[PDB]
Design an enzyme around this catalytic site. Structure first.
Site, PDB file in Angstrom:
ATOM      1  CD  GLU A  86      -3.460  -0.332   1.706  1.00 53.41           C
ATOM      2  OE1 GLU A  86      -3.636   0.033   2.274  1.00 53.41           O
ATOM      3  OE2 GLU A  86      -4.165  -1.675   1.885  1.00 53.41           O
ATOM      4  CG  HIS A 143      -3.170   3.562   1.493  1.00 53.18           C
ATOM      5  ND1 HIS A 143      -2.769   3.163   2.170  1.00 53.18           N
ATOM      6  CD2 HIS A 143      -2.396   4.877   2.026  1.00 53.18           C
ATOM      7  CE1 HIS A 143      -3.768   3.361   3.315  1.00 53.18           C
ATOM      8  NE2 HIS A 143      -3.102   4.818   3.362  1.00 53.18           N
ATOM      9  CE  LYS A 170      -4.618   8.100   5.180  1.00 51.06           C
ATOM     10  NZ  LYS A 170      -2.950   7.641   5.830  1.00 51.06           N
TER      11      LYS A 170
HETATM   12  C1  LIG Z   1      -1.825   8.179   5.206  1.00 52.83           C
HETATM   13  O1  LIG Z   1      -2.055   6.472   4.023  1.00 52.83           O
HETATM   14  C2  LIG Z   1      -2.229   9.067   4.212  1.00 52.83           C
HETATM   15  C3  LIG Z   1      -0.444   9.330   3.132  1.00 52.83           C
HETATM   16  C4  LIG Z   1      -1.264  10.711   2.583  1.00 52.83           C
HETATM   17  O2  LIG Z   1      -1.090  11.672   3.125  1.00 52.83           O
HETATM   18  O3  LIG Z   1      -1.722  10.304   1.211  1.00 52.83           O
HETATM   19  C5  LIG Z   1      -0.037   9.978   4.107  1.00 52.83           C
HETATM   20  C6  LIG Z   1       0.699   8.502   5.750  1.00 52.83           C
HETATM   21  O4  LIG Z   1       1.627   8.480   6.102  1.00 52.83           O
HETATM   22  C7  LIG Z   1      -0.663   7.931   5.704  1.00 52.83           C
HETATM   23  O5  LIG Z   1      -0.663   7.059   6.327  1.00 52.83           O
END
Ligand SMILES: *[C@@]1(O)C[C@@H](C(=O)O)C[C@@H](O)[C@@H]1O
Ligand SMILES: *[C@@]1(O)C[C@@H](C(=O)O)C[C@@H](O)[C@@H]1O
Lengths: 252, 252
Positions: A86, A143, A170
């Site tokens: 990810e 992600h 998220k």
């Molecule tokens: C998260 O995956 C969001 C990320 C982003 O800013 O797109 C940054 C990562 O450190 C965080 O875990």
């Protein structure tokens, strides 16, 4: 809406909360970064554990966590091992990933952990239960560094995180067009309007997606990431500039 | 894309251009405002003629235009009578509206005029032709202060302005939901991706729509309005804050 309060920060009300990521490869690097970072203004500190090279040693990892917490005793602290699958820096076994996260939970040093949804439902649910039993909140994450799923797909993914016990779902997705940035905002808004049980964090990555990192308050992203010196993902801007924009939008 | 260059400002390239509106009810008020406004930083000065009370006298109007141009000889100057039908301060006959605009064109004092699309196709086309014959550009505009049309409707409206000779089509719409703000951004992007012949100016009004005033560079709005002391439409923010945000986005 069930907000999440960590150290007198309320996630899911008001202005989106600003997260910065600490990336240190070793103990001395983490020490130096924690000292520099405590002179920046932000709401939540994320430790990107996957940048730490001595990941095989649980105790090395805990020693680094303690360096961070000692430098910043009053900051909300999110422990994140981002897998290479990810977009993180390295790969570990699922069992070692769960061990590190449970160790973090047990330490009392961290307020939140990140668990990746695609680790597997049963393992995620059991670890969520463990975190909750020990008064640690879970940011459950996903992600896509290649493309942006459909809005309907992203909503269903975030809803599944909710179903599995996530305190804060998220998702971060990579736009391949400007239209994909609007898709991400669309899915975000759909959660705010129709599935508003938990605060969610959403972002469209890269330069094209930057507006998603700024518009959280209107469309419903509860937090946003800024860079202290180096970005922890594509598209993050300087944390001070991020803060300026959030404040202007909040007060518009 | 056919850009529009006025006094070495290129509309339709780079960062969205910042427009502020001068609203003075009388000659002394216009004088005072022009003197204050020349200490603000922005790209284009719009004179909102509909706020001027002595509108019946073409020569009074021209005298006020000259006060403005003398205070700011080097600024791009847009002459806008906004009808009450489209959210302005007063109503005049179509014939008087065209007279005032042709007088402005003839004066050599203004660089651009605003013509409302719904004045009527034949009158708009003839006045566009007049402006072009006298080296004045046309911002052709439409406002919906009640609601947001569909994206398809807004695109067709902007395309019709292009067809009628507009140098810069403009639409401002009132959101009744956050979804309506995304609709406006969607229509904006559709013009950039598929109907990119002329720079367009778009905005979703009110607090909810503020993000549309900030995100012009990514989705394709060529200009945005800020407030010096008082907004000339709902949703405008302080011009200095607007500029801060545009610069951060441009440099992200
Ligand atoms: C998260 O995956 C969001 C990320 C982003 O800013 O797109 C940054 C990562 O450190 C965080 O875990
Ligand atoms: C235009 O109609 C846009 C308005 C806005 O900012 O929404 C301001 C007006 O003065 C201008 O003519």
């Amino acid at each position: 809406m069930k907000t999440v309060t960590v150290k007198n920060l309320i996630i899911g009300e008001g202005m989106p909360k600003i997260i910065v990521s600490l990336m240190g490869r070793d103990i001395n690097s983490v020490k130096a970064e924690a000292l520099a970072y405590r002179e920046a203004t932000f709401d939540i500190l994320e430790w990107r554990v996957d940048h730490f090279m001595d990941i095989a040693s649980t105790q090395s990892v805990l020693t680094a966590a303690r360096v961070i917490r000692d430098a910043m005793p009053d900051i909300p602290l999110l422990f994140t091992f981002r897998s290479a699958k990810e977009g993180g820096e390295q790969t570990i076994t699922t069992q070692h990933y769960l061990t590190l996260n449970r160790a973090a939970i047990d330490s009392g040093l961290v307020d939140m952990i990140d668990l990746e949804l695609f680790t597997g439902d049963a393992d995620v649910k059991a670890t969520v239960d463990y975190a909750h039993a020990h008064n640690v909140y879970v940011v459950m994450s996903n992600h896509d560094f290649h493309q942006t799923p459909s809005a309907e797909e992203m909503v269903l993914r975030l809803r599944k995180m909710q179903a599995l016990g996530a305190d804060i779902p998220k998702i971060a997705v990579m736009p391949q067009s400007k239209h994909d940035v609007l898709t991400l905002l669309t899915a975000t808004l759909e959660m705010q309007q129709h599935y508003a049980d938990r605060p969610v964090i959403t972002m469209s990555m890269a330069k094209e997606g930057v507006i998603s990192r700024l518009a959280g308050e209107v469309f419903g992203s509860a937090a946003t990431f800024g860079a202290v010196k180096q970005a922890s993902a594509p598209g993050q801007i300087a944390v001070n500039d991020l803060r300026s924009v959030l404040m202007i939008l909040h007060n518009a």
